[PDB]
Amino acid sequence: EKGEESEYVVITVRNEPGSMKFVYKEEHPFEKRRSEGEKIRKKYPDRVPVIVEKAPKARIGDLDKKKYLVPSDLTVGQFYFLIRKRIHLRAEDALFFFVNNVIPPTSATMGQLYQEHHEEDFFLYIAYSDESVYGL
Amino acid sequence: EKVEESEYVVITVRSMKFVYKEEHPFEKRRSEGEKIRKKYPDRVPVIVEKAPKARIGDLDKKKYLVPSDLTVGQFYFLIRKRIHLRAEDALFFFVNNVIPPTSATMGQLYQEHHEEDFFLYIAYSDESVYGL
Amino acid sequence: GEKGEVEESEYVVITVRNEPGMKFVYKEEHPFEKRRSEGEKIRKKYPDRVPVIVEKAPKARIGDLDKKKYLVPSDLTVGQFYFLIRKRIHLRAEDALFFFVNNVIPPTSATMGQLYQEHHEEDFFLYIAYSDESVYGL
């Protein structure tokens, strides 16, 4: 694009989670996930179970383990720190979380995100990706 | 700077004029902003310029057409890499001299802060505080 | 960590450590009435600045600050304050630094004036604890 007939620098989102399918949901039937989510939420009412998987086609390192049991008051920012270290990202490498394809505030708590976004199996689902954008 | 006469550690922050507004009169900007917003309703036009005397690299271009859902944090990453910042180096946006949330979207900022020419105006800077 | 009872893959269990939860040395060093007089005086002298006590969460694996009393612009963000502290205590980009107000991490884009308006104590000081990631997992 160019217009004021100067060109725009066009920025475009790439390899967003969008409506990604989690391997966890493919691998385990609903009743098994729901029973597990119910039981871990009863066992630890002040913690939330979270599935973390990579956005398809994200140009980013693999995550060894996908199932997290997190204090409800833990911030997104603190969870970023732990996940970056599990992936062994360089400080200069981008990492963004998406819940339902929306990047959450770093000061949000995992409990706030869970209360708003947990699925019917009582898990919170987080996709991670790189910057997921180009054009500059 | 010393009742409780111990000295304070004093921090000091270090009026933005956009070259885009000096290059193009209001009527020309407004006509363009109107036209790009009609053509691409799920995109917003954004003027990005460097705070004067930020000791940070310049961008070649100031006019950006961005997805409404693009985050501040995503835009940060593209600029940091383009001007070769180290991970340790600071970069912030200022919209009406206020640093937005890194999770805020361009569409959210544009809805709240677009000027009457239908452009969102962003200044980028370093930490924009004096060294201690 | 622990196997799920039903979906038997292990959880990575995340645990907080060395959170503020905490007694400020500034409140030990100066009685209430002395702190209040000082806070009153500095707020009258500099209406567009706020006085802030910054102290390290006990056992945080992070450098101490030489000084605890800060006089900051009301418009200064948490993020701008982080940049200056990282430089002071020689933190690498990959090293964590978080603030806690009343044991809650504030938005990085929050201003010190916003935090002060909401959280200043009755001595007219805003109290900030700083820590490392304050979490581990396995």
Side-chain angles (χ1 to χ4, degrees), chain B residues 36-88:
Chain B
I36 207 69
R37 283 284 298 143
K38 296 324 146 283
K39 190 170 184 187
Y40 300 115
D42 312 305
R43 302 175 151 276
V44 293
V46 187
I47 302 307
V48 181
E49 288 186 36
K50 187 182 81 201
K53 308 174 49 44
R55 189 196 206 76
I56 197 184
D58 258 72
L59 291 173
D60 284 31
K61 297 283 204 225
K62 73 182 66 229
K63 194 168 55 155
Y64 296 80
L65 183 60
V66 309
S68 293
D69 298 338
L70 173 68
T71 70
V72 166
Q74 284 171 302
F75 210 163
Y76 281 166
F77 175 83
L78 289 183
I79 298 164
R80 300 174 54 88
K81 187 183 202 188
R82 186 66 192 91
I83 72 185
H84 315 285
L85 292 191
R86 290 171 287 111
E88 287 74 22

Side-chain angles (χ1 to χ4, degrees), chain A residues 7-88:
Chain A
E7 251 157 14
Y8 294 83
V9 177
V10 177
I11 308 306
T12 304
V13 170
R14 59 168 170 80
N15 48 266
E16 59 281 298
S19 229
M20 109 184 216
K21 277 65 70 250
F22 283 72
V23 173
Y24 190 76
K25 293 202 252 160
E26 294 300 321
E27 177 160 0
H28 304 297
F30 174 74
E31 51 82 21
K32 178 178 221 198
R33 291 185 266 118
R34 173 67 178 243
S35 178
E36 178 59 27
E38 274 174 355
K39 288 186 194 184
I40 205 72
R41 284 285 294 143
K42 266 181 285 276
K43 188 175 189 191
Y44 299 115
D46 57 315
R47 299 171 157 273
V48 295
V50 184
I51 306 305
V52 182
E53 290 184 33
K54 185 193 322 183
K57 306 193 206 306
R59 294 184 211 129
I60 194 170
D62 292 342
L63 181 54
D64 49 356
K65 296 168 189 187
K66 70 177 50 182
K67 195 169 63 174
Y68 295 83
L69 183 62
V70 189
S72 294
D73 297 341
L74 191 75
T75 69
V76 170
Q78 289 173 291
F79 199 49
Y80 272 131
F81 178 87
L82 288 167
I83 298 297
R84 291 175 67 93
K85 219 133 195 173
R86 294 205 71 91
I87 301 172
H88 315 286

Side-chain angles (χ1 to χ4, degrees), chain C residues 88-106:
Chain C
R88 186 55 73 191
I89 67 187
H90 313 283
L91 295 183
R92 270 227 145 205
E94 52 277 14
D95 296 324
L97 172 65
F98 293 104
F99 279 177
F100 300 74
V101 183
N102 299 323
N103 207 42
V104 179
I105 300 176

Side-chain angles (χ1 to χ4, degrees), chain C residues 41-59:
Chain C
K41 287 327 199 193
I42 207 67
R43 284 289 293 143
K44 293 167 195 165
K45 189 174 189 189
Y46 296 119
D48 303 307
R49 301 176 152 285
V50 295
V52 185
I53 305 307
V54 184
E55 291 187 31
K56 185 178 88 197
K59 302 196 172 205

